[PDB]
Design a binder for this molecule. Structure first.
Ligand SMILES: CCc1nc(N)nc(N)c1C#C[C@H](C)c1cc2c(c(-c3ccc(CN)cc3)c1)OCO2
Ligand SMILES: CCc1nc(N)nc(N)c1C#C[C@H](C)c1cc2c(c(-c3ccc(CN)cc3)c1)OCO2
Lengths: 161, 161
């Protein structure tokens, strides 16, 4: 199945990891832990930010533009992106805002990092209906030496019921 | 012992409950639950906001001004406020910003509600040193019908070690 994983500031603002507070080391280790050995789907700007593939897994870029790097797989539609992952237990959609919006209908699981911080931003995570999603896990953490703000991991699963 | 209980928006902004998002019904029930049958200490503006005593417990107002309501106890110093609670297991300090600051050194426990919302505000909860406080409990909640933002209860205890 298809999962979205995203780090969210207040009012569900999202942004690229190079900047602060998305540079919470704890979130980076959470992200690595939940995408390890799974295929990842991302949009072109996310691919541009990261600059090179995430290791040891299929990296798929969803884009209307022809590909410019042969280390990853380029596709033009959502169904092409899904089919390119093959038969696997879980597909991870890792951003950005437009890709989250396209994949949210088919997604069955969300891995959210709620970061207790203010950031100015244009792009928000999709507005998932609280009614169709069941929170099944949450884990709060205080700000500490390495992490500049408090943050809460959460996992939700679609109430297909 | 002395405990501070407070609802905090991002960057530790605090405000009176009449306004939103401090009007999270879930926080109100959390507040009632943790102050029931305990003496409460508050500053004059908090007393002014609430307009009448919290029922079934000693209400102490810390203020440099002479009292104007005989249903509560008025005192002028922190030690007077503590002594007026008598011999009890737990004293609850319920605001506002100046009272939290005065009582934080003697406090041994914090009940914090982290509300995932933006509010403009002048007054912040005191900047407790993460080093002297151990988080011993946290419980995250999604926004729902009755609660307009997500929120996380947390309890910390002083590392007097
Ligand atoms: C972790 C963030 C993060 N947290 C959560 N919860 N969900 C997410 N979907 C992402 C993300 C992201 C995108 C793909 C992104 C964007 C980037 C990145 C990186 C990056 C990732 C791993 C490593 C390993 N060293 C280095 C960089 C990643 O680097 C510059 O822009
Ligand atoms: C609950 C907020 C709240 N949450 C948390 N975590 N910590 C807190 N220290 C307070 C608070 C507060 C102050 C005392 C306050 C200020 C107010 C209040 C009320 C009020 C309280 C109970 C009831 C019962 N119906 C009604 C009103 C309370 O009403 C107008 O201004």
């Amino acid at each position: 199945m298809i999962s979205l994983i995203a780090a969210l500031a207040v009012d569900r603002v999202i942004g690229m990891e190079n900047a602060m507070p998305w540079n919470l080391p704890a979130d980076l280790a959470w992200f690595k832990r939940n995408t390890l050995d799974k295929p990842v789907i991302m949009g072109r700007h996310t691919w541009e930010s990261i600059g090179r593939p995430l290791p040891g897994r299929k990296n798929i870029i969803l884009s209307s533009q022809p590909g410019t790097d042969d280390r990853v797989t380029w596709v033009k539609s959502v169904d092409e992106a899904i089919a390119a992952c093959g038969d696997v237990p879980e597909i991870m959609v890792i951003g950005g805002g437009r890709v989250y919006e396209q994949f949210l209908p088919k997604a069955q699981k969300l891995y959210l990092t709620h970061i207790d911080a203010e950031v100015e931003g244009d792009t928000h995570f999709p507005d998932y209906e609280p009614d169709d999603w069941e929170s099944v896990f949450s884990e709060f953490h205080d700000a500490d030496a390495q992490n500049s703000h408090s943050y809460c991991f959460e996992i939700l699963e679609r109430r297909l019921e």
